[PDB]
Design a protein around this motif. Sequence first.
Motif, PDB file in Angstrom:
ATOM      1  N   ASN A 191      -2.936   7.512   8.302  1.00 27.80           N
ATOM      2  CA  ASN A 191      -1.463   7.659   8.439  1.00 27.80           C
ATOM      3  C   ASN A 191      -0.720   6.523   7.798  1.00 27.80           C
ATOM      4  O   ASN A 191      -1.053   5.361   8.006  1.00 27.80           O
ATOM      5  CB  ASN A 191      -1.119   7.715   9.917  1.00 27.80           C
ATOM      6  N   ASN A 192       0.330   6.856   7.040  1.00 27.40           N
ATOM      7  CA  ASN A 192       1.086   5.812   6.329  1.00 27.40           C
ATOM      8  C   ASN A 192       1.864   4.848   7.229  1.00 27.40           C
ATOM      9  O   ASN A 192       2.232   3.738   6.851  1.00 27.40           O
ATOM     10  CB  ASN A 192       2.060   6.505   5.344  1.00 27.40           C
ATOM     11  N   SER A 193       2.018   5.225   8.487  1.00 23.71           N
ATOM     12  CA  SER A 193       2.588   4.340   9.483  1.00 23.71           C
ATOM     13  C   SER A 193       1.788   3.059   9.620  1.00 23.71           C
ATOM     14  O   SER A 193       2.301   2.053  10.109  1.00 23.71           O
ATOM     15  CB  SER A 193       2.674   5.061  10.855  1.00 23.71           C
ATOM     16  N   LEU A 194       0.497   3.082   9.236  1.00 21.93           N
ATOM     17  CA  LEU A 194      -0.357   1.929   9.409  1.00 21.93           C
ATOM     18  C   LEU A 194      -0.181   0.860   8.327  1.00 21.93           C
ATOM     19  O   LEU A 194      -0.685  -0.262   8.481  1.00 21.93           O
ATOM     20  CB  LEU A 194      -1.834   2.344   9.443  1.00 21.93           C
ATOM     21  N   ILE A 195       0.502   1.221   7.246  1.00 18.31           N
ATOM     22  CA  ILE A 195       0.674   0.320   6.096  1.00 18.31           C
ATOM     23  C   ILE A 195       1.516  -0.851   6.561  1.00 18.31           C
ATOM     24  O   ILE A 195       2.509  -0.671   7.278  1.00 18.31           O
ATOM     25  CB  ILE A 195       1.395   1.022   4.952  1.00 18.31           C
ATOM     26  N   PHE A 213      -4.681  -2.625  12.104  1.00 13.99           N
ATOM     27  CA  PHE A 213      -5.112  -1.546  13.029  1.00 13.99           C
ATOM     28  C   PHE A 213      -6.589  -1.643  13.331  1.00 13.99           C
ATOM     29  O   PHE A 213      -7.335  -2.257  12.591  1.00 13.99           O
ATOM     30  CB  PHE A 213      -4.799  -0.151  12.455  1.00 13.99           C
ATOM     31  N   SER A 214      -7.016  -1.135  14.498  1.00 20.49           N
ATOM     32  CA  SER A 214      -8.443  -1.123  14.830  1.00 20.49           C
ATOM     33  C   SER A 214      -9.088   0.179  14.416  1.00 20.49           C
ATOM     34  O   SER A 214      -8.470   1.228  14.290  1.00 20.49           O
ATOM     35  CB  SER A 214      -8.693  -1.341  16.305  1.00 20.49           C
ATOM     36  N   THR A 221       0.850  -1.230   0.000  1.00 20.69           N
ATOM     37  CA  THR A 221       0.000   0.000   0.000  1.00 20.69           C
ATOM     38  C   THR A 221       0.863   1.250   0.000  1.00 20.69           C
ATOM     39  O   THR A 221       1.878   1.306   0.745  1.00 20.69           O
ATOM     40  CB  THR A 221      -0.939   0.010   1.238  1.00 20.69           C
ATOM     41  N   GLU A 222       0.494   2.281  -0.786  1.00 18.01           N
ATOM     42  CA  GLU A 222       1.169   3.560  -0.748  1.00 18.01           C
ATOM     43  C   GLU A 222       0.344   4.671  -0.098  1.00 18.01           C
ATOM     44  O   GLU A 222       0.881   5.685   0.366  1.00 18.01           O
ATOM     45  CB  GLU A 222       1.653   3.974  -2.129  1.00 18.01           C
TER      46      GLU A 222
END
Length: 312
Positions: free
Chosen positions: A262-266, A270-271, A176-177
Amino acid sequence: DNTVNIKTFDKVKNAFGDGLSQSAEGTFTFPADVTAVKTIKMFIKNECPNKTCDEWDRYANVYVKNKTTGEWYEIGRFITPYWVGTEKLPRGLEIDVTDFKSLLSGNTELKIYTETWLAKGREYSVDFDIVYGTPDYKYSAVVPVVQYNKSSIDGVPYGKAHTLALKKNIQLPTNTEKAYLRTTISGWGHAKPYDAGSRGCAEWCFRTHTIAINNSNTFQHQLGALGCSANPINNQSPGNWTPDRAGWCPGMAVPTRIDVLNNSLIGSTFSYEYKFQNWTNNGTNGDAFYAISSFVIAKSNTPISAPVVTNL
């Protein structure tokens, strides 16, 4: 000129009665390749000459079927005008459905529904403009997170306890981007206690709800005044078309809310939690419900799988 138009439903009727159906389905040919799609706009025309339709302002929605799972995904929602159709808009009501371009490809099943309780019903024609160019991301995938949206009263109860999951886990693919949520929410009811201005819930009472990501309150959804009096479908008299509802108008699409993750989640799970603004129904003027759909979209320039949504 870079645009292709796809005619789909044509003079289809949603009605209530013996041998009639509130929903209609069809299978329509879309172009196979969506790699260069920039935008897809859906246009919904409602033909109601001479007061020949169910004159009430009814909940209505359009779905695309996922070809592998068989599940219906709500791509757009609207409330019919009172008395009249959309003829004041030459092209109809417009809803951007680009988020579903991965599903609007090849021979594709669609469904249109109206919460109509009269044989006269409502009659529609639906078409799509596909605008080609160079999207920022060649590939996209979309899946539902929640859908409590079959009708206005099949929404999530508001002000009353309920056992509907509005918490899910979401796994985004590692390639994912860009990822984001797409939410459509509308309220029904004139439940007490009223807010100021004699506004009952959930049609009239202005509220701000919240999406929590990994438990943190992240995105706010203000269901406020849209300016119903300014509706270009201004020929709805003598229906009650001018007062502002919370986040919708009669004879208008229900807004689509886009929340970029947020791209940190890629590459993580996550909930998601949809949190409704606290309120308690005293029971002295009926019930309140929020019809809601929320989707997660993943985009990339390499081919990607759908995000995976699970229960806790």
